[PDB]
């Protein structure tokens, strides 16, 4: 509900499912610098802090 | 060390080769020294640069 003191996450051992995450319907806007988003789907990382 | 010469001659040239193998680590100010990473997380228009 509030930026101030906003919520840190961290993610790891999973699969990170970015092919519904920034793909379905509901979703209004996304934009990645570094690395593009389908490159995105296709890499793996350490952990995410999110 | 009566054959110093001769010695000398082969480590110059063997540290001359290990520098040249060695300086391809650096990243000379890109975000990456391998090519294939950036080839992989990235688009063609700022790959290039």
């Known amino acids: 509900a509030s930026v101030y003191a906003w919520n840190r996450k961290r993610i790891s051992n999973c699969v990170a499912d970015y092919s519904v995450l920034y793909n379905f319907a509901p979703f209004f806007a996304f934009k990645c610098y570094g690395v593009s988003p389908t490159k995105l789907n296709d890499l793996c990382f350490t952990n995410v802090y999110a | 060390?009566?054959?110093?010469?001769?010695?000398?001659?082969?480590?110059?040239?063997?540290?001359?080769?290990?520098?040249?193998v060695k300086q391809l680590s650096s990243k000379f100010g890109a975000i990456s020294s391998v090519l294939n990473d950036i080839l992989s997380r990235l688009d063609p228009p700022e790959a290039e640069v």
């Open chain 2, 1 to 20: 060390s009566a054959l110093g010469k001769l010695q000398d001659v082969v480590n110059h040239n063997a540290q001359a080769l290990n520098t040249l």
